[PDB]
Amino acid sequence: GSRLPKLYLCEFCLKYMKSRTILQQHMKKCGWF
Numbered sequence: 001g002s003r004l005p006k007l008y009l010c011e012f013c014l015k016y017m018k019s020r021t022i023l024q025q026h027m028k029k030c031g032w033f
């Protein structure tokens, strides 16, 4: 295929996080609204 690894995309600013745990932490930062 394209050999593109699907990472953990943020749904607020749309960035690819490496870990789900880190994404959860990020979701707090991006959820400060």
Ligand SMILES: [Zn+2]
Binding pocket: 010, 011, 012, 013, 014, 015, 026, 030
């Ligand atoms: Zn974000």
